Amino acid sequence: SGPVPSRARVYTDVNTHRPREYWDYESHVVEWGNQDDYQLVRKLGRGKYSEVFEAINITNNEKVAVKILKPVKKKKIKREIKILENLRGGPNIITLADIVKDPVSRTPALVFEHVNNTDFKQLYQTLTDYDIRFYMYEILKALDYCHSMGIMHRDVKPHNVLIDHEHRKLRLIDWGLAEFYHPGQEYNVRVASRYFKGPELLVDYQMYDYSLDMWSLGCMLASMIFRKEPFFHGHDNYDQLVRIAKVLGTEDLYDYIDKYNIELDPRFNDILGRHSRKRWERFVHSENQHLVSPEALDFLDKLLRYDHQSRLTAREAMEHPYFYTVVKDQARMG
Ligand SMILES: Nc1ncnc2c1ncn2[C@@H]1O[C@H](COP(=O)(O)OP(=O)(O)NP(=O)(O)O)[C@@H](O)[C@H]1O
Ligand SMILES: [Cl-]
Numbered sequence: 334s335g336p337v338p339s340r341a342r343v344y345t346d347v348n349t350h351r352p353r354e355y356w357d358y359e360s361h362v363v364e365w366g367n368q369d370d371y372q373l374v375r376k377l378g379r380g381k382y383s384e385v386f387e388a389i390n391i392t393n394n395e396k397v398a399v400k401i402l403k404p405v406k407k408k409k410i411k412r413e414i415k416i417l418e419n420l421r422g423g424p425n426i427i428t429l430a431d432i433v434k435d436p437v438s439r440t441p442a443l444v445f446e447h448v449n450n451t452d453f454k455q456l457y458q459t460l461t462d463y464d465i466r467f468y469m470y471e472i473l474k475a476l477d478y479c480h481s482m483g484i485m486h487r488d489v490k491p492h493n494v495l496i497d498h499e500h501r502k503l504r505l506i507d508w509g510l511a512e513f514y515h516p517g518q519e520y521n522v523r524v525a526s527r528y529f530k531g532p533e534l535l536v537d538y539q540m541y542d543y544s545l546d547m548w549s550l551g552c553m554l555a556s557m558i559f560r561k562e563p564f565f566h567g568h569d570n571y572d573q574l575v576r577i578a579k580v581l582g583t584e585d586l587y588d589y590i591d592k593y594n595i596e597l598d599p600r601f602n603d604i605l606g607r608h609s610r611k612r613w614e615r616f617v618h619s620e621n622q623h624l625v626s627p628e629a630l631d632f633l634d635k636l637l638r639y640d641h642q643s644r645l646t647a648r649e650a651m652e653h654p655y656f657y658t659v660v661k662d663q664a665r666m667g
């Protein structure tokens with residue numbers, strides 16, 4: 334009589350229907366490239382698990398990007414490599430062009446297509462309402478694609494979305510926490526960034542699915558339309574669920590837990606208490622009111638729901654009328 338099972342509403346068996354080797358990434362054998370074929374130009378930044386550099390492919394002088402992984406188990410390296418290989422060709426996902434080793438460290442050096450080192454998080458200040466819709470749809474293409482190829486990103490956040498605003502091109506990056514979805518598998522909840530974690534991770538519900546990403550995307554949307562960064566600003570893991578409950582109310586939270594018979598720390602129950610559902614209009618101010626339309630609020634509602642199985646899928650999100658006009662975009666660069 335543990336917690337109740339769950340299987341994804343969409344793309345449930347896509348990995349099942351594929352050959353083993355599609356998803357059995359521990360078995361993958363990396364083909365190494367020519368390390369003397371890429372020379373680093375300059376440092377573009379970093380992350381908790383990589384150094385990213387602009388570089389050049391010398392055999393044709395083409396511009397690339399090179400992510401040098403810090404040390405770390407080969408299990409994950411093969412997982413990120415296989416995923417990136419599987420997704421190559423998909424809309425708006427970063428293209429893996431080679432893997433080589435760092436000359437001195439001998440660690441893997443992932444060659445990608447070059448983008449601008451400019452992300453969605455940098456552009457929060459300036460985006461018109463049309464542009465928020467537009468880029469949101471571009472991210473959805475990536476999620477729908479990855480989810481349909483059996484893959485959960487599990488780290489959707491503005492830092493992980495590169496935008497070339499000049500060319501109106503977005504790529505979803507940082508697949509290092511991505512995993513393959515298998516109905517009935519339990520996944521670690523130490524995925525994603527505090528502010529973008531679904532209530533499932535926050536209550537240790539491990540039989541989660543692609544719909545985690547859809548919560549994270551809702552959280553990104555909310556910060557952008559309300560100009561509050563982040564939107565749910567939890568100071569620790571438990572406080573993250575308390576902040577969500579202060580907006581979305583506790584009655585549905587407690588209905589979600591008893592839906593899936595999840596075991597919550599009694600003492601943490603006491604901390605949550607009872608919070609009434611705030612109407613999404615509470616966070617409208619003069620400074621953000623031009624970003625907030627009824628279709629925006631309806632879309633967010635359908636994303637920010639405690640029950641992972643209730644949230645819009647990427648495809649259903651793509652059909653939502655928040656994207657009615659922007660799908661007709663006439664592709665003006667300037
Ligand atoms: N293909 C790329 N083109 C340009 N910049 C990139 C590219 N990939 C990553 N970066 C840059 O790296 C900096 C930090 O990105 P980061 O999230 O570290 O990417 P990552 O290479 O996936 N690293 P990690 O988080 O360790 O996996 C940002 O300024 C990004 O612009
Ligand atoms: Cl971020």
Ligand SMILES: [Cl-]
Binds near residue numbers: 512520
């Ligand atoms: Cl995992």
Ligand SMILES: [Cl-]
Binds near residue numbers: 477480543646647
């Ligand atoms: Cl989906």
